[PDB]
Structure formats: structure tokens, C-alpha cells
Design an enzyme around this catalytic site. Sequence first.
Site, PDB file in Angstrom:
ATOM      1  N   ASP A 159       0.894  -1.139   0.000  1.00  0.00           N
ATOM      2  CA  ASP A 159       0.000   0.000   0.000  1.00  0.00           C
ATOM      3  C   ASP A 159       0.938   1.194   0.000  1.00  0.00           C
ATOM      4  O   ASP A 159       1.419   1.660   1.031  1.00  0.00           O
ATOM      5  CB  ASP A 159      -0.887   0.020   1.258  1.00  0.00           C
ATOM      6  CG  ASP A 159      -1.837   1.222   1.284  1.00  0.00           C
ATOM      7  OD1 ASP A 159      -1.797   2.088   0.406  1.00  0.00           O
ATOM      8  OD2 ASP A 159      -2.639   1.307   2.202  1.00  0.00           O
ATOM      9  N   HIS A 172      -4.291  -1.037  -0.887  1.00  0.00           N
ATOM     10  CA  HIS A 172      -4.967   0.047  -0.182  1.00  0.00           C
ATOM     11  C   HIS A 172      -6.436  -0.262   0.007  1.00  0.00           C
ATOM     12  O   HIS A 172      -7.074   0.303   0.901  1.00  0.00           O
ATOM     13  CB  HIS A 172      -4.828   1.357  -0.958  1.00  0.00           C
ATOM     14  CG  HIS A 172      -5.186   2.603  -0.129  1.00  0.00           C
ATOM     15  ND1 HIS A 172      -4.687   3.000   1.043  1.00  0.00           N
ATOM     16  CD2 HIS A 172      -6.114   3.542  -0.517  1.00  0.00           C
ATOM     17  CE1 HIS A 172      -5.263   4.137   1.372  1.00  0.00           C
ATOM     18  NE2 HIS A 172      -6.114   4.444   0.426  1.00  0.00           N
TER      19      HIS A 172
END
Length: 197
Positions: A159, A172
Site C-alpha cells: 500500500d 490500499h
Amino acid sequence: RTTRDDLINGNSASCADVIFIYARGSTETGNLGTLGPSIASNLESAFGKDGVWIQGVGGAYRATLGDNALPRGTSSAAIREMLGLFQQANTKCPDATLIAGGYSQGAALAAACIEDLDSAIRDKIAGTVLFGYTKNLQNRGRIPNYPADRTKVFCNTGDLVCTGSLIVAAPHLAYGPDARGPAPEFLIEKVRAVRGS
Ligand code: MAC
């Protein structure tokens, strides 16, 4: 479900013992988005429906994606909206324990508001959870002015927003399991640490 305004709607004469204030990610709906409802259902299991008020940050917080690029990772209007909710919690229910959280832009908003909060209110927040924290590298996994033992950050490997970028990659969008288990587990444990049970 995605909108919860329990603090705004709640009667001062029957304050909940725990008040949870949460800010959603960019472009998400209501004022809780995709992760907030999962955390809310598990807090209600723990403290009972009347025992916890769930409040999302709505109003001026539009969760506009482009505002991730502003200095604090969100707009000044959004930060003002979340502090106003903390000032309402502190006035409406001065004995309630507070807990809080944010995802993505909402995690930067959460951290920016805690940094600016009056310390007597900030010190009532028993625990905070941050998912996909966009200022994770810049703040070295901390929230400014707030203890490390009351902070839990969920930042997935891959992420890129946790590693100083604003690129949105698939990790994410993978915080669902955390919102279902470890994040409510952490919040309940921090509330019971100070309230007993
Ligand atoms: C987590 C949080 O509320 O920050 Hg103002």
C-alpha cells in the site's frame, strides 16, 4: 449502515459510555464508508447498542480525492468539522470515553485533528485506529502529540500511501479483515483498560 449520526442525534440526558468518531476514505459514501460499519457492529456487540454512540465525520468533510495533496493530507474545512464533533462530544457527554479512527484521507484527517485538539479532550481518546495512513512515513507511524500505546496503524505491504506516495494500489483497498477483527479488538481493549468492565 453507511451513515451514523449517533452523537449529533443523541440525548444529553442519556449519554452513551463510549463515543466512536470515524472519518471515511476518499470518495466513500455516507459518513462511514466501506470500513466504518464493520467496526461499528463489533463495538455494538461489545458495549451494547445504548452503550456506544457511532458518529461519522460528515458535514464539510467531502472526502475529495484531490485534497490528499494538501499540506495536512486533507482540507482545513474537514479538520474543523472533526474537531467540532470532538468538542460536541466533550460538552454533551463529559464522562464518556472516546475512541476514534480513519481510513486513507480520513486517517490523515484523524491525525491532523488530534494534533490540533485541546489536550484535555485529546487525552480522553483511549485508542485510535488508522488504516492506509497517508502520512505513515512522514509521521513515522505516529500521531503527533498522542501516545504510541494508544495508536494502532494498519498499513498493508504494497500500500504505497504508507510509504510516502499518493498512488492507490490494490493493497490500499484490502483492509476489510482488519476492520472486522483486529481494529475493533484493539479499540475494545483500550476502552476496557481505562473503564474496567
Ligand atoms: C482518530 C481521531 O479522531 O483523530 Hg480527531
